[PDB]
Design a binder for this molecule. Structure first.
Ligand SMILES: Nc1ncnc2c1ncn2[C@@H]1O[C@H](COP(=O)(O)OP(=O)(O)O)[C@@H](O)[C@H]1O
Ligand SMILES: Nc1ncnc2c1ncn2[C@@H]1O[C@H](COP(=O)(O)OP(=O)(O)O)[C@@H](O)[C@H]1O
Ligand SMILES: Nc1ncnc2c1ncn2[C@@H]1O[C@H](COP(=O)(O)OP(=O)(O)O)[C@@H](O)[C@H]1O
Ligand SMILES: Nc1ncnc2c1ncn2[C@@H]1O[C@H](COP(=O)(O)OP(=O)(O)O)[C@@H](O)[C@H]1O
Ligand SMILES: [Mg+2]
Ligand SMILES: [Mg+2]
Ligand SMILES: [Mg+2]
Ligand SMILES: [Mg+2]
Ligand SMILES: [Mg+2]
Ligand SMILES: [Mg+2]
Ligand SMILES: [Mg+2]
Ligand SMILES: [Mg+2]
Ligand SMILES: [Mg+2]
Ligand SMILES: [Mg+2]
Lengths: 254, 254, 254, 254
């Protein structure tokens, strides 16, 4: 447990990259709550990446909220490569025929053929599968991916299901399956200045620190004096830290 | 997630049994903190037992603190049998030769013989094992167990280690091993009006609810009116509930 | 390891019990096969029972083949509790919607309420699960189990399905799910002179000895002695034993 | 399953590479055994390589026995990536404190600092772990690996130890720990015409075909053809194939 202290750091805001598109309603809600509370409940989870920088793997909305509220440093928890894995979320639309984004005039080259290579995107109903193969796309595969996801994401009662799960579709479900990305692929996206669609990458992260409740007043100055105050704050919080190994239901309110 | 609401209940204090001895310093600390905060951070974890009663499986000190502070009902989380298992803690004394409770005049019938039956208690050092066999004890096995545990528990820098763990002892460690109890054995202890020693039973519990922060003012009346207020409180808290599946480090302070 | 050698024993046929009804079609082919070969390829797997008897946990048809062939002694491997577990086979009726023996059961008290207590039997179709809870049974739990299984086993195509299988039922499927028995419960069936329905219990056994190839002649004339020959035989075979740990596909011919 | 049948193939000896140095004592006994029997009991397990070649992942000594015996063709089973994993064997030197080749290594830059990056090699005694980090190496990582292993393999008693083993070192033990290689890395060694030190790589392979017993005569005169005989042979053997899933002890004689 005595290593967590070392992973909780204040990082300059300009050193942090995002790889995932934000959700506008989620950002408004996160920003309003941070502004009201003037604390950050959970530190932003980051991994070290190229060029001395840090990449958010959990906390896009918290990060953007803190930035907009004028924070010059971000409370992060630095996650080591051995303590996370990357999977994907499948997206279950519980009544596809009432999902306007899916019943629209279709323009992409969906096909039912199974090929030797893995499909870029798979759309499933109870009886059939349609595929998009990377080899058939003209637009940047990233722009096609985002168009597909955003067509139904805010409007069709989507339920995210772990890509590894066992799921049986009823007679009107649609299931969207996406391929898991490796960390190197995500870094190439960031290097290009791009982001992946929201709610598709699924980081499984061991050892997250919760309920740190960092007061925003520690985050407004890029320089020091605040570092002694940060250490004092952290020492006090770590005194009350406890570890839980099984599944937990955390009440996130005061 | 929508089942947790049903498991969080206010139970009359007189319907709740303990099976484990409290630690006096731990009780003082828990009671002081509850009194200062006038909230219960985490609900007491209980299992249904015989006679319409409930048995604490986590929260002896919280329970006794609430009782002493005048609570007539206890916020519990009812844990189902399929969501916990019972193991044991081994107790590592990091310098046994400086542990007065272990270097005392010895009176129990320790033996190095390995027998066909399982030992009641095992004391290990780096090279040797000594056993206490239930078949050799005169005193109630429970009273012998408590004498052994309390001889070193508060004084010899004990480190609790999961009975299933891999541990290598250095040249001065002592390791005390205790047998896991089954739920039926624990219930027989309670039926006798007895308790097992502190810090030996190890419940592994899936799905615990944390940071509920129940205000003590909801707990002082055995009758109702408070039940509508309990439902309103619970509805608000459950709105902010989130599930975490991997290991977490929870900061337990405000 | 020499521990294995000691578990390979010749047991009087009269001391061996079955817990599972046999299939005569499988019995004829097993008997035929053993008769042609004059060797028992794989020893019967048994567990030690009360009264000094043994219970077959794998080898119902081998046992009765040898028994029917006049063997006074059975080559067994004695399995310890630590090296096996008891699961269950599900039963899929792919045309169950047309299975007469199943759709006319007006007498048994099936129900759809999910209770806190595990159900005795579960019957699933594409959109409904029905449950038999032990607390509602009108007659002996075993004879009810038997009646359910036989209502479709003899008049409807069936295939076993493992618990791990992710199976999505189509419009005419029925899936029967049975609760796994503990070892104590199976010992009860056998001591009432009975058996469980065939094809339901699933024993997961580690460390089976394969390809011992015991000549049948060792299994008769026990009244003259056979221990000398047996150990002479075992020592020669044991020397070529090799341990394999993952899933294997064994070619069983020469 | 018929998928297995298709993975059992006769491969020209010239298209098969080894990744591991052999032991001549084990080679003589393997050759002797195959020569006496005139059958290859278990097929060589290989993976498809670049350029259309194959790499042995189990069967270094069987391959070279057949090769030394003049076989122009090798009976292999082609293993897919999904059915194996690459681990490592630890090396225990029970009298390592007196192992001269190990206690005089003044040249290699061992270090005790634990860094965020996994180490290349780890050397353990009862109270100290020393590490070789790839970023400190003076020469080729493979030749350093080789030098370390050979410093004790030829002049000190050694026994392999599995990763899962809970091992407490005594006063004179030394334990060497090696980092598991990925498949890409082993392919590199072979394409540089080299091998890794013996007894370190640990392949966990699921679905091995056992007891095929391929007659040696099928493996010569390939210049006249052998596909007809091969399939005739496989169809007869495949019909007696049986799948076993847990640990088995196979008697390998008739
Ligand atoms: N879990 C879900 O995933 C979404 C992720 O956003 P959230 O965790 O709230 O913010 P952040 O982007 O700061 O992690 C939430 O809307 C929540 O409902
Ligand atoms: N974990 C440890 O186990 C002990 C259990 O007591 P605690 O969880 O604080 O109170 P409760 O008895 O209310 O669960 C604590 O002293 C803590 O240090
Ligand atoms: N008729 C048979 N022909 C060939 N092998 C058989 C036959 N019956 C049994 N066996 C061998 O015994 C093993 C298990 O047989 P099984 O059908 O379970 O009968 P039992 O009831 O004796 O276990 C099989 O893996 C097979 O190798
Ligand atoms: N000398 C031998 N005698 C008997 N069986 C052998 C011999 N060599 C190899 N085998 C068979 O091959 C299997 C693996 O042999 P192994 O020692 O790993 O050599 P290889 O390098 O060919 O894998 C063993 O399980 C054994 O059944
Ligand atoms: Mg998040
Ligand atoms: Mg639907
Ligand atoms: Mg559309
Ligand atoms: Mg506790
Ligand atoms: Mg010590
Ligand atoms: Mg004492
Ligand atoms: Mg069987
Ligand atoms: Mg069907
Ligand atoms: Mg080998
Ligand atoms: Mg030693």
């Amino acid at each position: 447990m005595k290593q967590i202290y070392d992973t909780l750091q204040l990082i300059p805001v300009d050193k942090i990259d995002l790889h995932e598109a934000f959700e506008p309603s989620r950002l408004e809600k996160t920003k309003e709550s941070i502004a009201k509370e003037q604390h950050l409940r959970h530190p932003v989870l980051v991994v070290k990446t190229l060029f001395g920088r840090y990449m958010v793997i959990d906390g896009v909305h918290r990060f953007m909220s803190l930035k907009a509220l004028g924070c010059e440093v971000i409370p992060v928890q630095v996650i080591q490569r051995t303590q996370y894995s990357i999977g994907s979320w499948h997206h279950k639309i519980p009544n596809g025929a009432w999902c306007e984004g899916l019943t629209d005039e279709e323009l992409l080259p969906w096909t039912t053929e199974v090929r030797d290579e893995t499909p870029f995107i798979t759309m499933c109903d109870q009886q059939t599968e349609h595929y998009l193969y990377a080899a058939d796309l003209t637009a940047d595969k990233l722009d096609v991916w985002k168009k597909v996801v955003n067509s139904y994401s805010a409007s069709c009662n989507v339920e995210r299901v772990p890509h590894s799960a066992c799921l049986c579709l009823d007679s009107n479900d649609i299931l969207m399956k996406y391929q898991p990305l490796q960390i190197g692929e995500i870094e190439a996206v960031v290097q290009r200045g791009q982001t992946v669609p929201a709610g598709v990458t699924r980081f499984n992260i061991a050892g997250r620190c919760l309920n740190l409740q960092v007061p925003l007043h520690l985050l407004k100055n890029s320089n020091l004096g605040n570092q002694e105050q940060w250490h004092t704050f952290l020492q006090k919080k770590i005194e009350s830290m406890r570890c839980y190994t099984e599944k937990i239901y955390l009440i996130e309110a005061e």
